[PDB]
Amino acid sequence: LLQYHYDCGDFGMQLLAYPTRGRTVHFKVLDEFGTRFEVANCSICMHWLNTGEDGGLIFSAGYEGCHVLVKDGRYVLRVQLEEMLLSGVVAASYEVQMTCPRP
Amino acid sequence: PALLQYHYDCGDFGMQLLAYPTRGRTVHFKVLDEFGTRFEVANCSICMHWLNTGEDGGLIFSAGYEGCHVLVKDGRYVLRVQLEEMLLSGVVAASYEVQMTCPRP
Ligand SMILES: *[C@@H]1O[C@H](CO)[C@@H](O)[C@H](O)[C@H]1NC(C)=O
Ligand SMILES: *[C@@H]1O[C@H](CO)[C@@H](O)[C@H](O)[C@H]1NC(C)=O
Ligand SMILES: [Zn+2]
Ligand SMILES: [Zn+2]
Ligand SMILES: [Zn+2]
Ligand SMILES: [Zn+2]
Ligand SMILES: [Zn+2]
Ligand SMILES: [Zn+2]
Ligand SMILES: [Zn+2]
Ligand SMILES: [Zn+2]
Ligand SMILES: [Zn+2]
């Protein structure tokens, strides 16, 4: 159902999500112990949430952020997407693993 | 007519971006990341960027060198900023892109 796409850059990674009409998405970052971290506007962790000129939600994460790990020579970040109805119910949950090369 | 006067200064722990809008206009600052995303600037002490209006009409955007949007490129702190010259109604009269590099090349 949910459409999403992520890009690797030089200093960070970007995840674009386009939820169904009249739905919304909740972002949580996952550490290796399953904790879910809410993304906030002003924080030390070098991750952000924004809404584009279209209905899409942009998640930015710097490679040197909090929960970005190095595993087998690649930056890896796990993010959970909560597609949600206007009543507040979770319609679906998606887990995405963002992999990006590194020296 | 896009004649906004602005300049940036490099300091010891951060840099300052000064804009002097004319005719009762104001400026909103947005940081640009490498993916073209725009982050509007609000007071955030943990990200080390602040907004001020001097005793004169100038609008000040301060950014600490170790702030979260700030990158190191060729041994220099680099921040790419969009200036939105705005009327008090909220409309953007003009947009300027400035790349703040410190220390100066
Ligand atoms: C950041 O703040 C803006 C307005 O200041 C708000 O619209 C947005 O939802 C906030 N982002 C969050 C809470 O993740
Ligand atoms: C924002 O931060 C600056 C610098 O610390 C301060 O002068 C100002 O009062 C703060 N609040 C605003 C602009 O609302
Ligand atoms: Zn892409
Ligand atoms: Zn591609
Ligand atoms: Zn939630
Ligand atoms: Zn993070
Ligand atoms: Zn100056
Ligand atoms: Zn000094
Ligand atoms: Zn604005
Ligand atoms: Zn910020
Ligand atoms: Zn704008």
Author numbering:
A (entry chain B): 25 to 127
B (entry chain A): 23 to 127
Paper text:
Examination of the zinc-SAD data used for phasing revealed that asymmetric interaction of the cZP1-N1 homodimer moieties creates a negatively charged pocket where H71(A) coordinates a Zn2+ ion that faces the C269(A)-C390(A) intramolecular disulphide, as well as the C66 cross-link. The anomalous difference map of the data also shows a peak near H71(B) but, consistently with the much lower accessibility of the latter due to crystal packing, this site is weaker than the previous (~6 σ vs. 11 σ). In the Zn2+-soaked crystal, where H71(A) adopts a different orientation and is too far from C390 (A) to make an hydrogen bond, the C269(A)-C390(A) disulphide is partially reduced (most likely due to radiation damage) and H91(A) adopts two alternative conformations, one of which no longer stacks against W72(B) and chelates the Zn2+ together with H71(A) itself. Accordingly, molecular dynamics (MD) simulations suggest that, in solution, the two His residues can stably coordinate a zinc ion together with four water molecules. The observation that a Zn2+ ion can be bound by two His residues of cZP1-N1, one of which is invariant (cZP1 H71/hZP1 H82) and the other almost completely conserved (cZP1 H91/hZP1 H102), also raises a possible connection with the zinc spark response of mammalian oocytes to activation. The presence of a conserved Zn2+-binding site in ZP1, together with the finding that mutation of the two Zn2+-binding His severely impairs homodimerisation of hZP1-N1, suggests that zinc ions released by the zygote could modulate the architecture of the ZP by altering the conformation of its ZP1 cross-links.
Vertebrate oocytes are surrounded by a specialised extracellular coat that is referred to as zona pellucida in mammals (ZP) and vitelline envelope in non-mammals (VE). Although their fine morphological appearance differs between classes, all vertebrate egg coats consist of filaments made up of a variable number of glycoprotein components that polymerise using a common ZP module. Accordingly, a recombinant construct corresponding to the predicted ZP-N1 domain of cZP1 (cZP1-N1) is secreted both as a monomeric and a disulphide-bonded dimer, whereas a protein encompassing the trefoil domain and C-terminal ZP module of cZP1 (cZP1L600-R958) does not form intermolecular disulphides. Thus, by recapitulating the oligomeric status of full-length cZP1, cZP1-N1 harbours its cross-linking function.
